[PDB]
Amino acid sequence: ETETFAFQAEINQLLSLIINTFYSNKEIFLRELISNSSDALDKIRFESLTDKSKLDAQPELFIHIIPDKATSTLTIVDSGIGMTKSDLVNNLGTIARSGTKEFMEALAAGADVSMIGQFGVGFYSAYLVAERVVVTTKHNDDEQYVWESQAGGSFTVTRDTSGEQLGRGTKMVLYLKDDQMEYLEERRIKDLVKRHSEFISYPISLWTEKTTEK
């Protein structure tokens, strides 16, 4: 087909705080995404120590960052373990982990939005800089699906047909807000990566033409 779910209470509130307050440290979104994406690679790797055939669908473990100046989208893709549809509905909005409420309390008590990661809701940091996010994922156990939301209190999961099929993993596309146009520049991205990913152990490449960095 597509199915529609409404964000759990807590998460709606958080999504509001994120997309409606002006925060300073918006740049950590790329950290949180690159991370959540490392964590995903780790999983498919461990699953593969005892089953070499796990990565058959797509054998290289990687992270690609693809800034399209034209459509004004920063997009991140990994060959991580990916999400089943069930996983999409459960992690990206339907279940509200404990840190969600905890985080907002902390926020108002004057914590910094950069802690959004340490509280277990890192994913939504994307809406700091994006107005629409479109996650498309394929997990070994299920087919490719697409999660999409504009933070308007609900999200959609849809089976992927028209799309170009990933072997395995996840392709987050961030349709960037106006002011946030800076995360499309090659220099900026290269900075941000170096600055926060000095513990993450897979090839991160920048397809604003070609190559990989540090």
Added chain:
Amino acid sequence: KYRHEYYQKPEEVVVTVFAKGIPKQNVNIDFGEQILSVVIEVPGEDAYYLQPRLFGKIIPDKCKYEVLSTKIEICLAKADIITWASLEHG
């Protein structure tokens, strides 16, 4: 066996059984006020059983399921609009 998961909306609970290429014919699923029974038939050995006593109660006539090639989706219709804390009930 075969892996299972579930997610929930305020009105339904959706149990997925990850079973590749199961013939529509081999899946036998029945519903009860507070039970679910999934029995997909495996040709070689014993059947797969997923036969929990459900957390909440459900409306068995409103329950549907769908065999899909990667998975079998089962939409359980919650009898009461109340969030379940697990598929099963211990």
